[PDB]
Write a protein that binds this ligand. Structure first.
Ligand SMILES: Cc1cc2nc3c(=O)[nH]c(=O)nc-3n(C[C@H](O)[C@H](O)[C@H](O)COP(=O)(O)OP(=O)(O)OC[C@H]3O[C@@H](n4cnc5c(N)ncnc54)[C@H](O)[C@@H]3O)c2cc1C
Ligand SMILES: NC(=O)c1ccc[n+]([C@@H]2O[C@H](COP(=O)([O-])OP(=O)(O)OC[C@H]3O[C@@H](n4cnc5c(N)ncnc54)[C@H](OP(=O)(O)O)[C@@H]3O)[C@@H](O)[C@H]2O)c1
Ligand code: NFU
Ligand code: SF4
Ligand code: SF4
Ligand code: SF4
Ligand code: SF4
Ligand code: SF4
Ligand code: SF4
Ligand code: SF4
Ligand code: SF4
Ligand code: SF4
Ligand code: SF4
Ligand code: SF4
Ligand code: FES
Ligand SMILES: [Mg+2]
Lengths: 292, 339, 352, 255, 339
């Protein structure tokens, strides 16, 4: 968002960090934990609002900072949630955080999904692997604002059945969601012994309950699945002007100075922290190299 | 615009008077062939006719190695390390370096203004000087040869003195405080300025139009030239650490030996290094040396929306200071088919 | 580094300028200050003060550790300014230095040496208060270098002995024999068939009359302790040498500043030759014999002070152990270790 | 308290001396318990359980291989300190076999102790982290010890000395005098000491890992300035004598 | 960027398909030597190889004569005249005219967006075409020769068809709706594009750098050239009324014959007319013809902060359409001393 004096401090320092406390730790998968945070400043906690799809810079003191997307809805005011996978140094230190500990956060950064201009149209969310958390934010924003959006579909896929993000929440939500114009599809790709569904999301796009001409599509996951998902969506009649995807590059600041999250070419040179992380379909089509 | 003439015998007196405003940084000779911006104690050390500096003028605002925060790990607290910056004068800035400073201002004085950059940018007085082209200078191709703004005083070379352009109120104050040393510009000095401009335009090595360079670079990303020139590359990053318009930095948190205190550090980075694109899990978005080598060309030839220029200004530091004798302009002209 | 530079310059037929030689002597004095202060305060002080580590002596003997750190930092800062670093100096090139510091840095170095002279005095007093054990009293053959010029120093062309004779540096292997024992990776040395000692006490005994200043005053006062018979006088001799070398470094800095500005390095062309340089290390005589053939090293011979001192160490530990025979094993172990540490042994230089 | 042990293989003790001469080492005593460090401590036990083991020196004795196997058994983290432990040091400059060197130095005599050619510690055990230099910088020790005390680990360096050389504004010796500077392939952290004193880098901190040390480009640059192949190979193998990349990469450009 | 190719035999079919998106405006021949942007009913009338149009492309957004308001004088009320602008396609816009449209966008959409301009600008699709310069074109000196953005489709001339650049989602939709008529770009087409760029660069009359033109104009405002060229001037204003980047308009309130109703009208204005700088009491801030003549040069050579280029794009309309045979570029080069 455009929060003043709390996103850049009264000292006008964009690198200034806010003190937050971890209240709940929940292990989703083996290398995955869901963290519930709140700002130790009550006014800052009550004033901090974000957009679905935006990210924050989580500074573990003495180790470094990492960019994490927000998975909770912005209308759950006071608290925000982060889902973090153990990939290396900083995340190894993060996974040792027990409730009641204090960590530093600045944000929110980037542009989220344009959920304000998605008013009065269907929602199709396609989440692969770790991309469920930003789409969890979008999904919970849609569920809190159900009267605004039409039929919504949530496709969540993972390599194994134990690596599905928010499997318990989405499985518990499926009842009364099927009656509330919400369809949840959860599938695995490399697990042929999984009792549930199997296959890639492009197989389950046909099983969606969304009107193809009036649907907003949000895709999050590895860059390699994007081309196949684009082919499937274009074949079924989803308009290319409504397809949105998220990309990841190396980030050190999140404000546009370190120059590490660069994509594109000399014709269209862009930065993830300033021009994304949400990109449109035509941006992905025009310049190669944004995928893989 | 206000035009004043500084006679040849009052130049050193004016430079001495510039020390009353603050610290004076002017180009001096650090080795037999290399220059740099160093602090002035003796005014006779200033080299008015130099080609380029071993370090760009961005080192005064975008410092090469800077301490951002000091922290206590117990009671998590990051305290910003900003000192009171006193006014200083950067003398001898070429027009290409002035445009590079403007480009870096667009990068670092954006919607999130960098406090460390802005504090030092406020207190800096940029006095520009004229120059004669070298074999490595192509600022005419990038349109950074004549500066419009971004300075306070600009010194133009005349046979019998200098011509001073005043662009800001700070330059007006500098001229009006030492008005005893300045004179009035006649038609003869204007004619001499015109002659110097003609000679400067004649002294450039290349005279070409590079409008379609970005699109040809996009269309020719699978050229054999990239492999050929990347096999020569040392991955030393001098082309980025000496580039005036390179924004990249690397951050590191250093913990003191007590385990409680420490600091966060910021240093210049290069895209030629392996870890510039490493994204954890082993994936590098520029995994080969050819990829990083081409990424530098793509980044430098990109278009700056706020200014209308490329991020490359044309100083030739990447070509002159390359230890592997790799020509940036030569490879760009290979892409354009002009060789 | 400086002995190798001397050997290489002698081999290639090059003569350094006087100011460059003075700056090299200042760097060598910095090495001697650091090594002697480090030895005295962190290796032979804790076993005299009843500890097992200098890190356990932070609260009780605070002032002693503070002066230790100040002397060590002075030596380290001299080496950082002149050489590239305190360990493995890189600024010392063939024919001079890669880059010499500014004049104000040399003035600050002189001021810090002046400030550190009282610390050297306190160190000498503290180590004069200690004890020379009488179990190791015996006649010692002391070998030391004859200084070049008319002052106590490190560079020399002749090697003196307590027996009175003196021989040229290049003729060292005619009078010193290196033999390999079946219990150590080092080569023991013999002088006329007998073990000998090199070090600070040998330096004092051989070249005492060349001292000048507070060092000469302290030596004249405490000559009774500095008898060339007890190996435990080496620590006190090291303190006396610190006292001397601070003033010597001040004087050398004055000599160098008299000829400012200084060109950092002279162009040396590598002709063939054979150079032997015997400079006096903090622990004794260092012999470097290098033969150069077509810009390359063809013959290298290094004899280090500890290799010189090992045979005398064995003999004196034998007499100490026979004096403290059949006692408690711990007491014998600690006293034998104190005898060995009196020789400031560098085992690494023994094997080279 | 973190249990730290410093062990000495065949070394000059430069790394232990560098750690001992730091004034910040006094801050390590209240936060860490030094188990084995014979240079400063006398009550140190060799066979004890240590949280972090710092190993100095090359493996030039059979007893040293037994000691490093014991250390790997007894340590949760094994850190190789210095060029001797990381890449064999300058003792591995010569490729001549052990018996030739032994005959040249010690003659035909017996010592009853078994020596071996200098090899890095990584050949006999698994070193989790490395500290580079000869001797390593005080900043490297500070960063490593502090990150270990916080529970993290140091970040490996994959950038050349040229980065710190260009941050400090040092004149480039390779561009001006054509000197054989190994800086473009040597790991940073020394703040470009030798190029700042007018000397050329000899690569004490070691060549960059992760297969991004370009000896072929540097060999071509040296070849343009008039150097034979063997001079370049010896220069690069001064501290990188156990590197299999150097010979292949230089022979590629000279073929 | 998308680099689709249009074969030579599908060009007219694609132009016919463009009429499904709205009204098509393309350059047609109005007289023997003059062109203009006119509405297309027969596709064969489009002239792909033309030099310039008698009227700039700004007439579709900044209309030559527009009715802003209608009013009742009783109960004073001004009602805006905004009609529903249906989408239209402007085909054949040269790169200089695209840059001129960008400059006019900066003028008319900066802080108080012009509603009349904006409603028509948002509904216009700018399809650009390549061109070969003639004696009057100096768009390479003003750096408006190759377009970066501001278009949806750009047609590049090939011996066996066209090369189409797609820079907007609207162009993506236009290409994807008629993808049957388009093909894939090969290396041969890239080589042909490179050859055409080299030939276009060789076809320009002037190859000079004009960095110091503004400062030389400022220094030489008392030149005899101004008098000698103003004595030729007819004060007809064609140089302003046929200039793509001229913002000036004159407003007038016309009262109907009932005395109660009326309208407020807006038309293009020229600074060459007497009343452009005339204030009450008879004071004209450009009183003589020489003053207005010099003011046009000063205004056109001014620097645009938002874009980074001059307000003159280099089309040559002021030189080609001057009935008094006054050369704009010739006078500018006389000011620079290049004559
Ligand atoms: C917009 C965005 C949203 C993200 N959202 C999530 C999320 O919801 N959950 C989650 O588990 N992870 C997320 N990540 C990835 C997360 O940032 C990385 O897992 C983390 O930065 C790597 O930590 P590490 O300890 O492995 O660092 P190391 O591998 O040790 O590397 C150190 C530095 O590398 C950088 N880095 C490494 N990988 C990445 C990366 N993928 N993106 C950016 N910087 C990187 C960081 O600055 C980090 O400090 C997101 C990344 C981006 C760019
Ligand atoms: N957090 C966010 O909101 C967000 C947003 C954007 C990006 N991301 C990033 O996206 C990644 C998430 O994915 P992940 O790394 O966890 O993936 P992964 O599980 O390791 O592999 C991709 C998964 O998608 C399946 N898949 C489906 N269609 C595919 C296709 N066409 N090509 C390839 N795989 C396809 C794979 O099947 P196979 O195993 O058979 O290939 C596998 O199950 C993370 O890097 C995450 O940070 C996250
Ligand atoms: N002093 C001393 Fe050394 Ni480490 C011995 N033996 C070499 O000079
Ligand atoms: S300066 Fe030359 S050798 Fe070094 S990284 Fe740049 S292109 Fe490669
Ligand atoms: S990406 Fe490379 S060229 Fe671009 S600013 Fe960063 S270091 Fe410089
Ligand atoms: S790319 Fe080269 S010429 Fe361009 S600004 Fe950077 S250093 Fe200068
Ligand atoms: S690039 Fe241009 S402005 Fe810069 S030094 Fe060279 S000639 Fe001067
Ligand atoms: S790495 Fe260097 S300093 Fe450390 S022990 Fe080996 S030779 Fe000595
Ligand atoms: S002197 Fe050596 S380290 Fe410094 S920039 Fe040149 S090559 Fe790199
Ligand atoms: S410049 Fe090279 S040799 Fe000198 S300290 Fe640094 S890494 Fe070691
Ligand atoms: S077109 Fe020519 S004659 Fe007419 S007003 Fe312009 S300059 Fe004068
Ligand atoms: S002042 Fe003259 S030249 Fe400038 S915009 Fe107005 S009419 Fe055009
Ligand atoms: S001044 Fe003349 S050449 Fe320039 S844009 Fe206007 S009409 Fe075209
Ligand atoms: S000025 Fe340039 S772009 Fe415009 S018509 Fe002439 S050649 Fe074409
Ligand atoms: S994260 Fe630094 S530029 Fe985007
Ligand atoms: Mg020997």
């Amino acid at each position: 968002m455009m929060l003043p004096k709390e996103i850049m401090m009264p000292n006008d320092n964009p690198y200034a960090l806010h003190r937050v406390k971890v209240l709940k730790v929940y292990s989703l998968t083996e290398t995955e934990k869901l963290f519930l945070f709140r700002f130790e400043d009550p006014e800052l906690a009550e004033k901090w609002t974000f957009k679905p799809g935006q990210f924050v810079q989580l500074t573990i003191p003495g180790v470094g900072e990492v960019p994490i997307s927000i998975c909770s809805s912005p209308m759950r005011k006071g608290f925000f949630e982060l889902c973090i996978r153990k990939a290396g140094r900083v995340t190894t230190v993060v996974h040792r955080l027990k409730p009641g500990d204090t960590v530093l956060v600045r944000g929110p950064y980037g542009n989220g999904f344009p959920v304000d201009e998605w008013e009065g149209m269907d929602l199709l969310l396609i989440a692969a692997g770790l991309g469920t958390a930003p789409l969890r934010s979008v999904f919970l924003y849609a569920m809190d604002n159900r009267w605004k959006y039409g039929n919504i579909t949530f496709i969540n896929t993972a390599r194994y059945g134990k690596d599905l993000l928010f499997y318990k929440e989405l499985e518990a939500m499926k009842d009364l969601a099927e009656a509330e114009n919400v369809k949840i599809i959860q599938s695995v790709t490399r697990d042929p012994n999984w009792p549930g569904l199997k296959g890639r999301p492009q197989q389950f796009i046909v099983e969606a309950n969304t009107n193809p001409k009036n649907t907003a599509v949000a895709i999050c996951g590895p860059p390699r699945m994007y081309k196949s998902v684009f082919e499937a969506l274009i074949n079924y009649g989803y308009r290319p002007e409504n397809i949105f995807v998220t990309l990841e590059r190396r980030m050190k600041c999140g404000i546009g100075k370190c120059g590490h999250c660069n994509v594109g070419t000399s014709t269209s040179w862009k930065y993830i922290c300033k021009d994304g992380p949400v990109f449109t379909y035509f941006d992905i089509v025009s310049t190669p190299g944004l995928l893989d | 615009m206000r035009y004043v003439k500084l006679p040849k015998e009052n130049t050193y007196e004016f430079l001495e008077r510039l020390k009353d405003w603050g610290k004076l940084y002017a180009p001096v000779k650090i080795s037999d062939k290399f220059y740099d911006f160093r602090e002035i104690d003796d005014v006779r050390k200033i080299e008015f006719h130099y080609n380029r500096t071993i370090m760009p003028p961005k080192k005064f605002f975008f410092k090469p190695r800077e301490k951002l925060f000091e922290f206590d790990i117990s009671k998590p607290e990051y305290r910003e390390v900003i000192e009171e910056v006193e006014p200083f004068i950067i003398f001898g800035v070429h027009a290409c370096d002035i445009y590079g400073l403007k480009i870096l201002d667009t990068v670092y004085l954006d919607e999130f203004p960098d406090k460390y950059y802005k504090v030092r940018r406020e207190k800096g007085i940029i006095i520009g000087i004229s120059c004669m082209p070298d074999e490595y200078c192509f600022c005419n191709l990038r349109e950074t040869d004549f500066a419009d703004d971004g300075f306070d005083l600009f010194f133009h070379e005349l046979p019998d003195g200098w011509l001073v352009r005043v662009g800001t109120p700070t330059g007006h104050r500098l001229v009006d405080k030492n008005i005893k040393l300045f004179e009035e510009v006649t038609d003869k000095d204007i004619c001499a300025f015109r002659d110097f401009e003609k000679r400067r335009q004649q002294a450039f090595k290349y005279h070409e139009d590079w409008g379609n360079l970005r699109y040809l670079l996009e269309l020719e990303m699978e050229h054999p030239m990239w492999d050929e020139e990347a096999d020569k590359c040392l991955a030393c990053g001098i082309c980025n650490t000496t580039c005036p318009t390179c924004r990249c930095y690397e951050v590191q948190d250093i913990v003191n030996l007590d385990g409680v205190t420490g600091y966060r550090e910021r240093r210049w980075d290069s895209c030629q290094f392996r870890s510039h694109g490493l994204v954890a899990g082993g994936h590098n978005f520029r995994p080969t040396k050819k990829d990083r080598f081409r990424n530098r060309y793509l980044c430098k030839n990109a278009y700056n929306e706020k200014l209308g220029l490329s991020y490359c200004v044309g100083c030739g530091r990447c070509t002159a200071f390359c230890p592997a004798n790799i020509s940036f302009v030569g490879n760009l002209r290979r892409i354009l088919g002009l060789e | 580094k400086l002995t190798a530079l001397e050997a290489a310059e002698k081999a290639v037929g090059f003569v350094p300028r006087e100011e460059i030689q003075a700056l090299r002597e200042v760097l060598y004095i910095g090495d001697m200050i650091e090594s002697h202060a480090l030895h005295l305060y962190l290796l032979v002080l804790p076993d005299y003060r009843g500890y097992s580590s200098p890190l356990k002596m932070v609260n009780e003997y605070k002032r002693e550790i503070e002066i230790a750190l100040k002397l060590k930092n002075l030596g380290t800062w001299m080496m950082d300014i002149l050489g590239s670093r305190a360990i493995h100096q890189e600024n010392a090139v063939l024919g001079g230095f890669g880059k010499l510091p500014e004049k104000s840095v040399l003035e600050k170095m002189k001021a810090e040496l002046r400030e550190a002279l009282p610390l050297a005095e306190y160190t000498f007093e503290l180590f004069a208060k200690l004890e020379q054990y009488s179990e190791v009293e015996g006649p010692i053959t002391h070998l030391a270098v004859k200084p070049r010029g008319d002052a106590y120093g490190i560079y020399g062309d002749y090697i003196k002995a307590s027996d009175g004779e003196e021989f040229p540096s290049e003729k060292y292997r005619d009078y010193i024999k290196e033999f390999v024992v079946e219990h150590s990776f080092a080569k023991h040395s013999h002088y006329k068939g007998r073990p000998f000692m090199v070090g600070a006490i040998s330096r004092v005994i051989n070249n005492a009359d060349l001292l000048y200043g507070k060092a000469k005053e302290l030596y004249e006062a405490n000559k009774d302790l500095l008898k060339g018979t007890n190996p435990f006088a080496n620590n006190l001799a090291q303190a006396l040498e610190i006292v001397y070398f601070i003033e010597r470094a001040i004087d050398l800095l004055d000599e160098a500043l008299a000829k400012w500005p200084i060109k950092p390095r002279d162009e040396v062309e590598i002709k063939d030759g054979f150079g032997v340089s015997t400079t006096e290390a903090p622990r004794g005589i260092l012999v470097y014999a290098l033969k150069v053939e077509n810009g390359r090293v063809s013959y290298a011979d290094i004899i280090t002070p500890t290799a010189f001192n090992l045979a005398m160490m064995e003999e004196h530990v034998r007499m100490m152990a026979e004096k403290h025979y059949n006692d408690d094993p711990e007491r014998l172990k600690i006293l034998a270790e104190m005898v060995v540490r009196a020789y400031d042994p560098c085992i690494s230089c023994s094997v080279h | 308290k973190v249990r730290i042990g410093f062990y000495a293989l065949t070394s000059c003790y430069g790394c232990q001396l560098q750690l001992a001469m730091m004034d910040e080492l006094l801050q390590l005593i209240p936060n860490a318990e030094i188990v084995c460090w014979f240079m400063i401590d006398r009550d140190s036990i060799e066979d004890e359980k240590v949280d972090i083991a710092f190993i100095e020196g090359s493996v030039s004795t059979e007893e040293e291989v037994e000691l490093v196997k014991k250390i790997r058994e007894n340590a949760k983290i094994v850190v190789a300190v210095g060029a001797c432990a990381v890449q064999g040091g300058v003792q591995s400059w010569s490729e001549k076999p052990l018996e030739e060197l032994w005959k040249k130095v010690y003659g035909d005599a017996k010592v009853k102790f078994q020596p071996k050619k200098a090899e890095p510690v990584s050949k006999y055990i698994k070193v989790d982290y490395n500290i580079y230099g000869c001797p390593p910088e005080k900043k490297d020790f500070l960063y490593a010890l502090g990150t270990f005390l916080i529970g993290s680990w140091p970040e490996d360096i994959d950038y050349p000395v040229c980065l710190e050389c260009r941050l400090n504004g040092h004149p480039c010796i390779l561009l001006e005098k054509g000197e054989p500077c190994l800086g473009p392939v040597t790991r940073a952290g020394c703040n470009a000491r030798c190029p700042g004193f007018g000397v050329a880098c000899i690569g004490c901190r070691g060549a960059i890992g992760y297969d991004v040390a370009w000896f072929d480009s540097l060999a071509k640059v040296f070849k343009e300035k008039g150097m034979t192949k063997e001079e370049i190979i010896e220069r690069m193998k001064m501290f990188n004598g156990h590197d299999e990349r150097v010979e292949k990469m230089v022979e590629k450009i000279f073929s």
